[PDB]
Amino acid sequence: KVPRGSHMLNVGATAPDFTLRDQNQQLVTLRGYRGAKNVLLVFFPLAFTGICQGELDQLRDHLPEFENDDSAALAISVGPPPTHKIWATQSGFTFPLLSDFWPHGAVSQAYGVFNEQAGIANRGTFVVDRSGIIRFAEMKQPGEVRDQRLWTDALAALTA
Amino acid sequence: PRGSHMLNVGATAPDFTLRDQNQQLVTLRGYRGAKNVLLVFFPLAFTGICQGELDQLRDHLPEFENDDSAALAISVGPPPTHKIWATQSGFTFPLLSDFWPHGAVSQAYGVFNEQAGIANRGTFVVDRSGIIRFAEMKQPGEVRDQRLWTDALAALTA
Amino acid sequence: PRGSHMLNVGATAPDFTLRDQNQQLVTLRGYRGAKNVLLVFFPLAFTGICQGELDQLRDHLPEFENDDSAALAISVGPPPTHKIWATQSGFTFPLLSDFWPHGAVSQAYGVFNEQAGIANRGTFVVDRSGIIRFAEMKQPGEVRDQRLWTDALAALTA
Amino acid sequence: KVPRGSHMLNVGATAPDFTLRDQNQQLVTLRGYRGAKNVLLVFFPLAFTGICQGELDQLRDHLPEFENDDSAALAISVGPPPTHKIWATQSGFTFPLLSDFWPHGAVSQAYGVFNEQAGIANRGTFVVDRSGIIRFAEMKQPGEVRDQRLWTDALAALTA
Amino acid sequence: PRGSHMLNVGATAPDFTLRDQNQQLVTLRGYRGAKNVLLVFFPLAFTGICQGELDQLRDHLPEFENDDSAALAISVGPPPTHKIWATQSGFTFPLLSDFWPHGAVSQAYGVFNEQAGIANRGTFVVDRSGIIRFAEMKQPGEVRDQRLWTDALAALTA
Amino acid sequence: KVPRGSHMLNVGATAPDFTLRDQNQQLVTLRGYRGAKNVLLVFFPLAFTGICQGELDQLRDHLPEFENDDSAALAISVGPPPTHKIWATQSGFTFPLLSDFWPHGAVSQAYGVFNEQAGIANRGTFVVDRSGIIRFAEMKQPGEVRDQRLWTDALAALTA
Amino acid sequence: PRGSHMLNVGATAPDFTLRDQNQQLVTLRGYRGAKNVLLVFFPLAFTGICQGELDQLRDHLPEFENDDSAALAISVGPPPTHKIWATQSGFTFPLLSDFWPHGAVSQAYGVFNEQAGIANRGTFVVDRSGIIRFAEMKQPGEVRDQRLWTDALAALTA
Amino acid sequence: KVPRGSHMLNVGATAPDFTLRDQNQQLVTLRGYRGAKNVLLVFFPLAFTGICQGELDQLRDHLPEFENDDSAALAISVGPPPTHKIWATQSGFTFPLLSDFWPHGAVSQAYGVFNEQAGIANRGTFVVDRSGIIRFAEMKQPGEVRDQRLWTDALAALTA
């Protein structure tokens, strides 16, 4: 992985590939979706707190729109699997929460959405198409929340 | 570069671009998103158990070459060798040359015999995502089962 | 607040918001317009006829939890109690706490035993309009029939 | 019910719930349609006379558009069931006519379409959606008649 | 004005507007373009072969009153007479009054008995174009066949 | 029939009803189509000559568009059945040619498309809808031919 | 101009415009892109094996004249001759006059008897592209098989 | 054939008919497609070299769009069948390559796309409709390549 810190990757770029453990210790690889599904990557700072409890709840509340024959959704944070597992159980999250745990924030850094001062990923979101190219990219600033409707719009255009 | 340690189901299939018997370039990546791909490695043109094996593939080709899939046979022989053999044998599917570097793709898939300098009889089915979904490498004397290949491909469709 | 005078078919199902075993808030109104809801009141976790009853619900869960319906089990126990029991029992459906105020929702549905401080074994199916369509409260000794629940739900669909 | 007299409720408001007897003595409750059908409420002044014989005839003449899998229609007036029953039989009305009889005009008052001087409901109409919210509201002044076409337009937009 | 010379199949059905038992106005033209119409003339309410005939229509009404057709019974009696008889008999289909002028519509259809001042037992099916497609007027003693009416209507649909 | 001579009836008018013999001596009545089909009436001057051999050939050449479940086409002229029969056989016309023969030109006069000086119908065309009302009307002046495409456009709008 | 050397399957069918029994002009090209065309050449109206042959075509006409195909009978006789024969025989399909120039179309198709001045009994099916798809010319004494014509036409459709 | 040299035939003209041998020695006739398919004619200068290896590869790469129930595609050049056969085998071309070999360039001359100085066809393309009329015509100048997308657009409009 080539660290970018917080210089967010924008549309047109090859999405950095990765292999991370989900909350149930299963390995998930980004390139495995190529040629099959568009992938929504939802980076978040920390389990149990802040604006992302609301943002992942948005993902949860409209999950059929993000996990279906054409699309997949993966949430990514620096926490380890035990942490994500407990949080997901208390939150009703059934989608994958991946651990960008050790090396710490390496994937977040590669996408340019890592807060080097706090050691947590910023609230960045990407849609990766079937060719492995980024087709939607955003990084919400503190004080503003993301909108799952924009995520579904972006995904709909890669099936339309 | 794995020699004879066959790649396992779930692994990403190594990419390759090789010349077929008509000197056309065939690239595995080219099928991604479109067809499942059957890869049939074989040791040597004109000899061995593989003549019977490729004859069975030939005898059932439409089942392996359609809108849902493609079949590629790979060996260390150069195009002129595969062209002559394909013409005499009635083979119309691509026979690819893992010729120079010698056995490089066979080695990447872990189906190369380092002592003899030829590919072992290994077979893989790669899905539309480029992932290995079926893998086998029968030992000396035992022939591969073409019906098993067709069943694995049928599983990756409908 | 009806004590043990069970609400009848046709009545509007009293609204409620209760914590499930994972401390998530579950509100009946949340299903309005979307799913029919099976409400299974039970007296006490870890004991009684209800272990057999909830085991039968568990054993047939996909038939009660789908795009057309949901099943909620309600008792006066707090979340920690229901969490332990659900984990040991293999229950993945919501077990809700009518804990404090004690038995308030059970009382609203008229299935509360005021002498013992526990819900009687009453069952209701609430339709997409929030209306009670099926109601029952079997007497001591007699177990409820899970097949009857599935039939009532099937009636409210297709 | 919180009486409003004739200050008609407009779109966006929760429609006051009610339980009234129809011409055949059956109880009809507004909240019973929530989560299932959009409801057209047609208030009218008096059975046997005036502009409403024409207005209910419009409802009758296009009934399939108002009573179907997505919509329900309820006419409401201060008359008692015996009166509505006779009128409906002589008029060919098969839809429900509800009695806002005693307390007199209480429901009409709650929707703000009650003529306090004459003791009859004004010619007010509402469409209540599946969430119980008013999505169409009108009150025709004497000298003008209502148009069932506007009622069907309003209903069509809550299925579209 | 044809007295007893029954109109024949192919003729345009004479228009009429008559009061039913509830004093509502029923006009034949109103069905044009929408439904086929069965016209059942009968002599006198409360007596004769027609009680059995209208009872059979009643007993099979949904087959005559649907999106494709309507059934109207016509006689010289006024609304109050038809209202009482319909209520006692369980008739919910329209009974129309060819009362004043007396027997005018029965005469136009050629099914009027000028000596007795009553309609004969004639039956017609009028199509969506207002054309008579079936016609009959059974003689004294012989009852009409309701199955024959349903068959004629079925012919004018699918 | 109320004669109008050549003051052509225009759209909105009730089409004068009629009963005329076709080339095979069968009676055809205009009102028989009401409530079932829209009817194209093609008046023409004389069998065997002039602009109408071309105009009826247009009708013939696109007949499926004029004789189907929604539409019917009737050509009308002052000639008797024997004349129309022979002409239709030599022309391949299978649609009805009706005789406005005796009284001479009475139907043509009623529609206002009769040439009183020559005793023949002018080249007038009408579309009669299912209610018996004229929805298209034209009368082509000598020197110009009619266009079957306009006839099909008019008919299409009464099914659309 | 081929005399009696019958055109073979695969050849382009020669174009023609000939008068039918009602003096209407019939052109082969007119069917291109729309219908397959059966061409039945025959020697002489009122005599020979062809009366039986055209009677069989008549007896099965709807199978040859529909949205997918048309049947045309061709001979050297003029319209008045074919009109009388068609009327007596009940023929409603077009009988075309290859009258003047005499036998010109029969000659173009290679089915003309130069010694007798009449067409031989040749039959062709022309497809929507104007290509001959079926061809035959039975010898004296042997009658043509109408079932064979219908089968050839069915092949050019569905 | 009436030679035009390089005065390219344009849309509206009858396409000169022809009968030529394909790479497998089979005769292909243009008029055989009339009343059945629209035909794409792709003229090219010389097998084994230049801009046309790329242009025929475009045809090959999107063949289903050019060879189907509504369309046919024929490539034409002055080379003889043995030459086209070898080239097609090395190129994966399964569509017909026709020989405008002897008389040399006669068909190319008839369509006005023959380079009289070099003795080879220019890179001309035509779409012939079901009536035998040219509906698309182009002749690309050296330095520019053709675009199969324009060919499919032209063909789509003759099925639309």
UniProtKB/Swiss-Prot annotation, chains A, D, F, H:
Additional note from the record: The active site is a conserved redox-active cysteine residue, the peroxidatic cysteine (C(P)), which makes the nucleophilic attack on the peroxide substrate. The peroxide oxidizes the C(P)-SH to cysteine sulfenic acid (C(P)-SOH), which then reacts with another cysteine residue, the resolving cysteine (C(R)), to form a disulfide bridge. The disulfide is subsequently reduced by an appropriate electron donor to complete the catalytic cycle. In this 1-Cys peroxiredoxin, no C(R) is present and C(P) instead forms a disulfide with a cysteine from another protein or with a small thiol molecule.
Encoding gene, per UniProt annotation: ahpE
Active site residues of this protein: C52
Chain's role: Thiol-specific peroxidase that catalyzes the reduction of hydrogen peroxide and organic hydroperoxides to water and alcohols, respectively. Plays a role in cell protection against oxidative stress by detoxifying peroxides. May represent an important antioxidant defense against cytotoxic peroxides, especially peroxynitrite, which can be formed by activated macrophages during infection.
Sorted UniProt keywords: Antioxidant, Oxidoreductase, Peroxidase, Redox-active center
Domain Thioredoxin, first and last residues per copy: 9-160
Entry EC no(s): 1.11.1.29
Reactions listed under catalytic activity: [mycoredoxin]-L-dithiol + a hydroperoxide = [mycoredoxin]-L-disulfide + an alcohol + H2O
Enzyme class: oxidoreductase
Protein name in the entry: Alkyl hydroperoxide reductase E
CDD domains per the UniProt record, alphabetical: PRX_AhpE_like
Domain of life: Bacteria
GO molecular function: peroxidase activity
